[PDB]
Amino acid sequence: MISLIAALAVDRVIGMENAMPWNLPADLAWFKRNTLDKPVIMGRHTWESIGRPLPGRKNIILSSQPGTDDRVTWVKSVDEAIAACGDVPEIMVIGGGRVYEQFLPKAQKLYLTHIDAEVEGDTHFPDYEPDDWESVFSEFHDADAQNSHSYCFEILERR
Numbered sequence: 001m002i003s004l005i006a007a008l009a010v011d012r013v014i015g016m017e018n019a020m021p022w023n024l025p026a027d028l029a030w031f032k033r034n035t036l037d038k039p040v041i042m043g044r045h046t047w048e049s050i051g052r053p054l055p056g057r058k059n060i061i062l063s064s065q066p067g068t069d070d071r072v073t074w075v076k077s078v079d080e081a082i083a084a085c086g087d088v089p090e091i092m093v094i095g096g097g098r099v100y101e102q103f104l105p106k107a108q109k110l111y112l113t114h115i116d117a118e119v120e121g122d123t124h125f126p127d128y129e130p131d132d133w134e135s136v137f138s139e140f141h142d143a144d145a146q147n148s149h150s151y152c153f154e155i156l157e158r159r
């Protein structure tokens, strides 16, 4: 089963860690818990963004160029990447944008963290149609000593 997971700002905006103005450790705990022990697909750009494989997960890089690092699995296409995952109950798509887009059509689920924050950014999560997706989980949290901003966890499943 294909899954997508992300953190969005005002208006479906998404960006890198350092590109990000917020600071929510709870969001990372949430991401960790939901990607741990599962394969994770990502584009090159996010790979480079992270800089080290994510521990506890098979890291697969969807990229068009030959990879320059033995610590992860390099894939050249959507089908390649899914096969590299072999038989697992859930595959997680971690981005970025093109990535997100290319898989949403395959996705059956969505883990999203809505962040209460306006920010200027080059990219956006794909415009997905809410009549098509059912919200099965939701949990709002005020900002705290830990978390800079207010955020909301939500999990949708394709009806």
Ligand SMILES: Nc1nc(=O)c2c([nH]1)NC[C@H](CCc1ccc(C(=O)N[C@@H](CCC(=O)O)C(=O)O)cc1)C2
Pocket (backbone or CB within 6 Å): 005, 006, 007, 017, 027, 028, 029, 030, 031, 032, 046, 050, 054, 055, 094, 095, 111, 112, 113
């Ligand atoms: N919910 C959600 N929030 C996010 O911020 C992102 C997504 N999804 N999906 C895509 C994306 C990828 C960026 C990204 C950057 C760093 C780490 C990272 O260090 N993860 C550690 C967290 C450290 C900790 O959990 O204390 C991990 O082991 O998963 C993960 C993802 C960022």
